[PDB]
Ligand binder design. Sequence first.
Ligand SMILES: [Mg+2]
Ligand SMILES: [Mg+2]
Ligand SMILES: [Mg+2]
Ligand SMILES: [Mg+2]
Ligand SMILES: [Mg+2]
Ligand SMILES: [Mg+2]
Ligand SMILES: [Mg+2]
Ligand SMILES: [Mg+2]
Ligand SMILES: [Mg+2]
Ligand SMILES: [Mg+2]
Ligand SMILES: [Mg+2]
Ligand SMILES: [Mg+2]
Ligand SMILES: [Mg+2]
Ligand SMILES: [Mg+2]
Ligand SMILES: [Mg+2]
Ligand SMILES: [Mg+2]
Ligand SMILES: [Mg+2]
Ligand SMILES: [Mg+2]
Ligand SMILES: [Mg+2]
Ligand SMILES: [Mg+2]
Ligand SMILES: [Mg+2]
Ligand SMILES: [Zn+2]
Lengths: 90, 142, 129, 141
Amino acid sequence: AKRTVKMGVMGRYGTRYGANPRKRAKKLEVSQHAKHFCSFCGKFAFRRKAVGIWRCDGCSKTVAGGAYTLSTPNNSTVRSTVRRLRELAK
Amino acid sequence: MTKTNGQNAARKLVRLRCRNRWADKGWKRAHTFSARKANPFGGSSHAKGIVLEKIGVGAKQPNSAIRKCVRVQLIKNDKKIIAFVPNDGCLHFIEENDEVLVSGFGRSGHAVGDIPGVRFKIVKVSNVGLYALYRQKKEKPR
Amino acid sequence: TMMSVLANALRTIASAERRGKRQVLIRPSSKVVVKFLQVMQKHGYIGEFEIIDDHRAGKIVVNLNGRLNKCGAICPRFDCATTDYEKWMKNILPSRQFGFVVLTTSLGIMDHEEARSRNTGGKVLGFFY
Amino acid sequence: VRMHGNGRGKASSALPYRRTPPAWLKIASRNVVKMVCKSSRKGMMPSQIGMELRDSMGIAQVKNVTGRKILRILKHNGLAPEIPEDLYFLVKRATQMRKHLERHTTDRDTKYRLILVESRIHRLARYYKRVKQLPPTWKYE
RNA sequence: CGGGUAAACGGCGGGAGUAAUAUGACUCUCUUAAGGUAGCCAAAUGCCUCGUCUUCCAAUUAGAGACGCGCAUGAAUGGA
RNA sequence: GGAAGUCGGCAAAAUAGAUGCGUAAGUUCGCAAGAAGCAUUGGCUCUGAGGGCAACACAAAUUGCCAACUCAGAACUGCUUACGGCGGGGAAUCCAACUGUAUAAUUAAAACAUAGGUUUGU
RNA sequence: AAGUUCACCGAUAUUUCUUCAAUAGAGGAAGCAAAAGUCGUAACAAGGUAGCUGUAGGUGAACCUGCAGCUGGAUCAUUU
RNA sequence: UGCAUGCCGUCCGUGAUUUUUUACUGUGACUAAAGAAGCGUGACUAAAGCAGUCAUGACUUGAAUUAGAAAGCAUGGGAUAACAAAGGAGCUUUUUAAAGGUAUUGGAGAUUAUGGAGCUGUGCGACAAAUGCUUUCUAGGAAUGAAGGAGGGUAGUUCGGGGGAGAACGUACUGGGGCGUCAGAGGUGAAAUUCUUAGACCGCACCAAGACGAACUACAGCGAAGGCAUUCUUCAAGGAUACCUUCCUCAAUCAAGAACCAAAGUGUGGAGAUCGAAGAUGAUUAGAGACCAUUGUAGUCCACACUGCAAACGAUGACACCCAUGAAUUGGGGAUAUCUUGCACGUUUUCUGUUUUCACGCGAAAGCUUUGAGGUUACAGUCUCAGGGGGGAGUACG
RNA sequence: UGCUGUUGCUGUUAAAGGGUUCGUAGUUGAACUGUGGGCUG
Ligand SMILES: [Mg+2]
Ligand SMILES: [Mg+2]
Ligand SMILES: [Mg+2]
Ligand SMILES: [Mg+2]
Ligand SMILES: [Mg+2]
Ligand SMILES: [Mg+2]
Ligand SMILES: [Mg+2]
Ligand SMILES: [Mg+2]
Ligand SMILES: [Mg+2]
Ligand SMILES: [Mg+2]
Ligand SMILES: [Mg+2]
Ligand SMILES: [Mg+2]
Ligand SMILES: [Mg+2]
Ligand SMILES: [Mg+2]
Ligand SMILES: [Mg+2]
Ligand SMILES: [Mg+2]
Ligand SMILES: [Mg+2]
Ligand SMILES: [Mg+2]
Ligand SMILES: [Mg+2]
Ligand SMILES: [Mg+2]
Ligand SMILES: [Mg+2]
Ligand SMILES: [Zn+2]
């Protein structure tokens, strides 16, 4: 059975700290504890150790970035921009 | 393009009629109970009561007159109503604390004529017909 | 989509008759449509007609002689006992002196006068006068 | 396309009344059957097999030359596709759209078209299960 | 000397008089940097004061709910 | 007899373990909640359930040996209600969101802190 | 025969919960029917700022203002 | 108490072998009175009643008959339909020879061979076969058709302000400096708030930032609706057309349930040029809180998450059939004059879309009209949503 | 009283088509197996 109607992980806080702060923190908490996709391996294997550090469960890879998710939206834009500018250079 | 027509479509037609009968104002009134509770008569044609006082009601425009009425408290449920007293004179026959028999005014609870908000009429006082006294075919008892 | 082939054909014939046309093309055809037309032909309400084969549901070309006033189908096909002929006659026929109600019975497709003589009931298909 | 959308087009082929070979076609029926099976082994689907025979091979309406239809011939020889041909193409279209939508999450027109295609798959799979052309638990993703 | 700034320190009257038994929608005047807005109240903030009405008791300077002529309520000096 | 005492229920009394049933308004949906409330419990003699390892053909679906405690049901029999230990409950107003800190030796709070909000310099 | 003890059927009383129907209340709102005092003129003519719909803010009062829409417009029409 | 006994089609019971209902319709059976219908009858008539009529009694007196929902019972008829099954490669007969392995013998109980019959493996005779073995290269040729219903395929690598992503252009509004000049500029019906010798307005070339994409632009195109307009690259779609490709009823329309949906509004991060709810300051005015002028906050723009309302309108639900004439126009295809050097154009047909000139007819009229608001008292193609005098009121309670 | 409409109502402007689609129960659903013949009046 479901055990909760919409509190999820934040059920550990009981009735403390207010509804909107709890709802805002829950979104980042779920992402921080999820398994993310490793493009080197081809499987869902990246876990966060400390803020900004992501380690693969099977292969020995460690990656930097994000603090609550593996990749931030600004970084993808930066990647495409860098690749296109380098394509112009070469 | 307004109704279904299939040979095995009786259930749809039955349900459609049942819901649309409620839109009939007359049909709904006879099949609900709100009107019966509202009616000072408990669904009867006549009722008896005690006269509280004599009042005059102004006729609605463009007519101009003072229509003679009384206010009555019914014996069956202690409700208070206003009843019109017809015919020339006929107010002297009615005294305070007299028992009267009240009837409808002919439009099934709707108001009648230029009398505002009056839907009842006096037909008997002290167990003697009011019209009989007016024609002098009987004498007021006691 | 098209639900009744017979209703489509009878509506087409009635319109062409109202517009004063001499020939009318009917598509698609079926066995029920052909039998209905033959009842009309026997009583002199239409002329000859031709059935064309095309390896599908065929087509019919009908010759009109101006004597038809209206033809139409009845949907759904209500059951009619031998005691219900009078009721149907008074409801959908202009008078009791002319016009026919067409039925399908166990003995075949026929008009109400023939059906009554043989003491059989059935289902109503249409009418003409 | 009338099941979904507002199209009312009427464009198709019209089969002839005379169902006899044109009498200049000297291919025997048994050669045509072997000719159909060879094209299947190459990897072509039955609808493409008919067009190859029609275009450069002189055979219009295989059914008129050999009394059988193309899918019936393949079924006899064990070369029929596992999933019916029209269902295979619809599933392939849905996969390509779903791959596109993960990169482009704001393409709301494509999301609308995906709902139409997925409804069509469920309607088509419902029919094939009833006529026993699919296992009773096929369950599209 | 000129500009800017109140989630800077702070301020938010001097007031009057008119109008449909009442009353004031209505009008006139005096006057400021500006003239208390949304809310809330005899409140841990009301002098008069044990204010006035309802409820709670046999009987309540106490309690609660209402009202507002608020000595001296009121918006990050944060209001509800 | 039951708060009449007193500024004031101060002090004292009172509730009480375990198991089954049952549980309101309000609400940030997590709670409120042990809400409130009703019932059972001893002793004795029995019964059932819950295990271990040893001996292409499908009731080794059976023979033997042995441990450790818990739960459930029944008959009979008894109370002077009887160690210790162990929440009293309900309806509302004011203040502070909450856990925390804090005048060693008269003040533990409504004070301080807090997460959250805003402004300034660079 | 009176009488003793146990099981079962079980009236009645009290207490607790559930449902249905009626009922008082300081104070606060709405509608209608009047009579006709008071203040203005939003609508109908381009009604004197074209009108109306949805939404947001303001305001003694009809209402005013911003954004998008409609003609039920005051135009069926002008680089052929 | 033998007193006795003799001088081919059917009937009935039981086993083996294999299959058609339901529904509609015609008869028939079984179905309390009273009540309704009605056969007879001069209770003086009638509402009634079932009685009475006529010459040691008769009328072998009378009191007839019918209809009553639906469901249940028997039977006969096969047109319109329903249910169930299937989804087409899970698809020979006969006649003789041989080998192997209960019932009658008097009845009752045991043991026993011989045979019947099926189970099979050998030869032989005769006749069929809906698909040619004297065959093809050794089970693989016997199946309604292909809907001017649905789905899918291939092609012009067709068509379009359809959708998403990324780079780059264009003037203009605002601002800023750089070069000049000097007395006002702005705004209005008329003015004033406002800017200006600390150089405004005006002029030239630039720089920054944010929006937007003029003229071409139309009773034109695309989209389910809301909506969509610079160029280039890129991703997945959509329609129409062409087809002697494939498939074979897979469909139409809807409670429940689901997705999208202008503007305004809400939350969290950006942005902030223009315009501008609230507010401020000038004017009009008896008053003016408005209309007008100068400003100005939220907003207007982007990303992610909500909201689900509009005169969300063609005030016209979806699918299908018939229907008068001439134009025009967008896309594709078929047949046979002009121009540039494959394109455009000319004439005539065709499929799809999109419009304009009181068609018959309809309507209270205004008006609608192949594109219906037509084909309806001569009233039946299919499904579905809503209404029942005006208010109270889309309000109260849940 | 065809002002409850199965027979038999209305829905451009009088009251009334849901903003647009998808979709399940439900309702509705194309054609085909099919002229018996011969002799008398
Ligand atoms: Mg106060
Ligand atoms: Mg006390
Ligand atoms: Mg108080
Ligand atoms: Mg006590
Ligand atoms: Mg005391
Ligand atoms: Mg005392
Ligand atoms: Mg104590
Ligand atoms: Mg308890
Ligand atoms: Mg605290
Ligand atoms: Mg604490
Ligand atoms: Mg101390
Ligand atoms: Mg202390
Ligand atoms: Mg503090
Ligand atoms: Mg006045
Ligand atoms: Mg105006
Ligand atoms: Mg087809
Ligand atoms: Mg400039
Ligand atoms: Mg300059
Ligand atoms: Mg917006
Ligand atoms: Mg002005
Ligand atoms: Mg401005
Ligand atoms: Zn890895």
